[PDB]
Amino acid sequence: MTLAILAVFSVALTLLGFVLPPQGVKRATLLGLALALASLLLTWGKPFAFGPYAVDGVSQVFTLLALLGALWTVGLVRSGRFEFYLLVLYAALGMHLLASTRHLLLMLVALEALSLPLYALATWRRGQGLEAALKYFLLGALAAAFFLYGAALFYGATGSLVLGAPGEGPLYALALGLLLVGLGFKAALAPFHFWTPDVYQGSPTPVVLFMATSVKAAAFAALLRVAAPPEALALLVALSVVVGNLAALAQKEAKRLLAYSSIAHAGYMALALYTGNAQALGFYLLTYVLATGLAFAVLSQISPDRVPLEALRGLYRKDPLLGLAFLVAMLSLLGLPPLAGFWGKYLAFAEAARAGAWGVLVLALVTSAVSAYYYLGLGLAVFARPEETPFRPGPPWARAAVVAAGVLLLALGLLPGLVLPALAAGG
């Protein structure tokens, strides 16, 4: 009954914001999201299903992550339009629904629910932001069509629109493919990745924080629900990691570089999909979400519109703690010890090798080493001599947020035997 909280706050604030100063609405939306997360903790080990709607360990972990991302992204945004909060609220529920069901059609409706309000969140209205928004909507609705014909073909090979239905030969194979298309696009796996560079660079940074954390989370959550075969998995991984890192090399811009990098990262997480461990994947995404949320909070404190790579430089001198935190984020996203990113990566790699897929694992790993070029090209870039750069040094809100996130990262780098004990049933 986190869903209850979500629907309630969204619907209520809709009309309330007519009577409230936009700030009052910000206070409100913030409050709501945090409360939903609270209900998530109080339900740990209490898994609950109602309709096609189902809350279990997975739903719990992945919406814990998603809710976290939504709170952080609302923290930064001070625009005096109450809707620029409202849309976030909507989107959040949408992602929760996406992670919370096996029903293909409810999954579809949930997809529209989460995806439509982000299209509107893509507008600072800076000339790029309309281009970004456009590409996003067109490619998005296309994928909508695909996941829908996929649900229709799943209902095709078998009596149900609910996943887990017994399944045929080639038609079933086809149907699982058509579900895999949309669900894959939403996660930025190659070669579905083309939007990712454009939209991250085009959309206002804090929004991108929201996307690059919450969306990827929810998407992998729904992905685990699908039955996907080893060969396809191999393909997606290979392409994601290769093109992701290689093209990320070519990147002169922080956001875009981060996009390609995130393509590679979706590539890494997709290995957990081999066994679908989800204690492992849950962990990986915990670490990743923390680090990335951090990274984009910092990219927000630089500029909302665009951040080049040099802008990151000299950040240590300016603010020591933010320099350090960004560094840590770069390392956790690199998957280097002793950071939680290493245990997430390791857990995915472990499930991968456990599944006995070797060449794939290897390639993923090799080009994962490729990623260190740009990961240090940022993390170390922190220490160079500061060039002329925009800097607005945050509220306590942001400083304490970013640092907290980093600390949570490295804490679980050393003691995953804290949370990992229950990313499972919740003991």
Partner: protein, 160 residues
């Protein structure tokens, strides 16, 4: 069945071909309206009737009328302007079109199904208990999606 069935499916494909072919946007959309009529017919013949009628009312009556309002409000009837035709793409676009049929064709080939259940014609009478019922959650989710849709669409325009 097949006597008229051939005719109706042929009309469907022909219409689609038009909506993707014609470079008159109005003509296109209109061809899609024709499409929705035939498709609704086929729905009914397929024992889905209510879905047919809502298909005409919403899809044909409402949606494409909003479309038409958009292309009438913005012109754009002559879509092909300012170019970047990149002609080497047209046969490549046409190529890919053939393939997505081929793969679906294969999966549906050598596929036989029991298209026999006594649906009793897809009147809303028997559909209602599914809607508010097994599908009620899907329904409420949808409704919420629509509400979010209206507020989104409003803030999306809303010059200020």
């Amino acid at each position: 069945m097949s006597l008229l069935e051939g005719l109706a499916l042929f009309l469907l494909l022909l219409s689609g071909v038009l909506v993707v072919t014609l470079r008159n946007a109005i003509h296109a959309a209109l061809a899609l309206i024709l499409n929705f009529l035939v498709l609704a017919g086929v729905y009914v013949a397929l024992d889905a009737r209510f879905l047919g009628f809502i298909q005409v009312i919403v899809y044909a009556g409402a949606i494409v009328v909003l479309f038409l309002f958009v292309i009438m409000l913005l012109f754009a009837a002559q879509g092909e302007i300012g170019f970047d035709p990149l002609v080497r793409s047209r046969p490549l676009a046409a190529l890919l079109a053939l393939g997505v049929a081929g793969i679906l064709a294969a999966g549906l080939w050598g596929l036989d199904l029991a298209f026999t259940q006594d649906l009793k014609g897809g009147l809303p009478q028997a559909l209602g208990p599914l809607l508010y019922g097994d599908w009620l959650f899907v329904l409420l989710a949808v409704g919420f999606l629509l509400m979010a849709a209206t507020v989104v669409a409003v803030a999306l325009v809303e010059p200020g």
